[PDB]
Amino acid sequence: SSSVPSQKTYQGSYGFRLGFLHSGTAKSVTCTYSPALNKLFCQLAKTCPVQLWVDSTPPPGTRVRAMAIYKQSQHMTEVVRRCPHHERCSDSDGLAPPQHLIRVEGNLRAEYLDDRNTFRHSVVVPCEPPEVGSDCTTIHYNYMCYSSCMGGMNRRPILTIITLEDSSGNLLGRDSFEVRVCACPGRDRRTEEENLRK
Ligand SMILES: Nc1n[nH]c(C(F)(F)F)c1Br
Ligand SMILES: [Zn+2]
């Protein structure tokens, strides 16, 4: 029942693309990224660092938006939202609406949008230059339901679409990755990578 945002990779004029830390697959890992699967595996509500890389610095007022969509064709028109349990668990920080799957952690300038026409959720933050001893800016995301949550994602895979935007919201660049929110990301990444090898 909602229009489907593009997931097509688009570096644009600034050469925009994502990067991910190399956190490994130990049983204790809270978030780990598989380049072979283009897939982030993370625990519920834990910090997911996502790097922003550009070839040239975009203008002041540039922002970065995150939105989830279902990966599969039969589900892509459905808004990705938190499940009936988690939307009612009183865990909002006062900024993120309790229905939103994706939050930004530790940024008081995060804004949360309920799109008036598509009803899709997204979270957008201003782009700032890298910290003093760093080559890239990093955003910390949290995912607020498990992939398995009944009445929400319900075991359906999702993509996160990251869009670099100007101050009006016009597209400057786009990238994306699949997400699985699960209890043991390290084990699940190993299993899915071993499966891909077979
Ligand atoms: N000075 C900068 N380096 N990288 C960025 C990014 F966030 F837009 F990617 C800026 Br703004
Ligand atoms: Zn849930």
Is-contact 28 16, C-beta < 8 A? Answer: no
Is-contact 102 121, C-beta < 8 A? Answer: yes
d(CA 183, CA 30): 9
Is-contact 144 102, C-beta < 8 A? Answer: yes
**Sheet of 121-126, strands arranged across:** 31-34, 39-42, 171-181, 158-165, 63-70, 121-126, 111-114
Residue 139 Cα to ligand 1 midpoint, Å, equals 11
Q: What is the DSSP letter of 61?
A: T
In ligand 1, which atom is closest to the CA atom of 52? 9
- Lookup result for tokens 């900024």: 95
Amino acid at site 65: R
Which residues, by Cβ under 5 Å, contact ligand 2, an ion? Answer: 83, 86, 145, 149, 152
Ligand 1: which residues within 6 Å by Cβ? 52, 54, 57-58, 62, 127-130, 137
The pick from 16, 53, 54 for probing ligand 1's pocket by mutation, whose C-beta has the most ligand atoms within 8 angstroms, reads 54
Residue 9 Cα to ligand 1 midpoint, Å, equals 18
d(CA 147, CA 51): 23
CB atoms within 10 A of CB 51: 16
In ligand 1, which atom is closest to the CA atom of 137? 7
CB atoms within 10 A of CB 192: 17
Closest CA to 97 of 78, 109, 81: 81
Method for structure elucidation: X-ray
Is-contact 135 40, C-beta < 8 A? Answer: no
Is-contact 155 2, C-beta < 8 A? Answer: no
Closest CA to 79 of 175, 156, 148, 1: 1
d(CA 119, CA 3): 9
In ligand 1, which atom is closest to the CA atom of 60? 11
Is-contact 67 124, C-beta < 8 A? Answer: no
CB atoms within 10 A of CB 53: 15
The alpha carbon of 193 is separated from its chain's Cα centroid by a whole number of angstroms, namely 21
Amino acid at site 184: C
d(CA 55, CA 143): 29
DSSP string, 113-156: EE-TTT--EEEEEE--PPPTT-SSEEEEEEE-S-TT-TTTTTT-
Torsion, CA 24, CA 26, CA 29, CA 31, rounded to 10: 40
HSE, CB side, 13 Å, CA atoms: give it for residue 153.
25
d(CA 143, CA 19): 18
What the block records as the tokens of 15 is 């050469």
